[PDB]
């Protein structure tokens, strides 16, 4: 199973296309393949701290059938809503 | 948005635990869900340009049943393999 070869040269073909670098392809060295499932939720929410109200952004990730709740992000959107 | 409010409280909680802040919930202002399905690829590979050889980090995210391939990372690892 060497689809890994296609992705490697193609990865050089896009750095060939992105940047103007003419790199020749040697061979695949190491590989790591992990299929990602689930359903990601972006939540914009209103919250309170020190009496003042703030607005944050929360990127939550789930694998609901495996009892997985993981929080990837908690950015601060608005200091003064 | 009745039990995604339930997941909005998740975010503020695991924030406070991970972050030691004291945010108290308010309400959700907006939310968009994104079901994800695909395969990701981490490949080190050997490259050649200008004579001597190199090795590159390559992050590759593809959705195989659409033949779509997305090249994300391509960071130079070392100029010595």
Identify the experimental approach.
Answer: X-ray
In the stretch 16-75 of chain A, residues with CB closer than 8 A to chain B read: 18, 21-49, 53-56, 58, 60, 69, 71, 74
Could you tell me which residues come within 8 angstroms of residue B64 by beta carbon, excluding any fewer than 6 positions away?
Answer: B38, B39
The residues, ordered by sequence, that sit 6+ positions from A75 with a Cβ below 8 Å of its Cβ are A56, A57
CA distance A7 to A29: 12
DSSP string, chain B: -TTTHHHHHHHHHHHHHHH----EEEEEEEEEEEE--EEEEEEEEEEESSSSEEEEEEEEEEEGGGTEEEE----EEES--
Phi and psi at B56, nearest 5°, equal: -125, 140
Pairwise CA distance, residues B15 & A48, whole Å? 13
Has domain B38-81 been given CATH number 3.90.1150.10?
Answer: no
Q: Is B20 exposed, middle or buried (0-12, 13-18, 19+ CB in 10 A)?
A: exposed
Which of A26, A59, A67 would best serve as a mutation to test chain B binding (most B beta carbons within 10 A)? A26
Q: Which fold has domain A39-81?
A: Nuclear Transport Factor 2; Chain: A, (3.10.450)
State how far Cα B48 lies from the chain centre: 29
Contacts 24+ apart (CB under 8 A), B2-10: B4/A41, B4/A43, B4/B28, B4/B31, B7/A41, B7/A43, B7/A60, B7/A69, B8/A43, B8/A45, B8/A58, B10/A60, B10/A69, B10/A71
Cited resolution, angstroms? 3.1
CA B59 vs CA A50, A69, B42: distances in Å: 42, 25, 5
Whether residue B44 contacts residue B56, with contact meaning beta carbons closer than 8 Å, is answered with yes
Beta strands in A1-81, from DSSP E residues, in sequence order:
24-36, 39-49, 52-63, 68-78
Of B14, B36, B43, the CB nearest to A7: B43
User: Is A57:B12 a contact under the CB 8 Å cutoff?
Assistant: no
**Residues B60, A35: Cα–Cα separation, whole Å:** 12
Backbone Cα Rg of chain B: 21
Domain ranges of chain A: 1-28, 39-81
- Residue bearing tokens 């690829």: B41
């Amino acid at each position: 199973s060497l689809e890994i070869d296609s992705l490697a040269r193609f990865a050089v073909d896009e750095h060939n296309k992105k940047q103007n670098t003419l790199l020749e392809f040697g061979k695949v060295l190491n590989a790591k393949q992990q299929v990602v499932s689930g359903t990601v939720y972006y939540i914009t929410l209103e919250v309170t701290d020190g009496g003042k109200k703030k607005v944050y952004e929360a990127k939550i990730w789930e694998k609901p059938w495996l009892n997985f709740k993981e929080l990837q992000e908690f950015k601060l959107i608005d200091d003064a809503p």
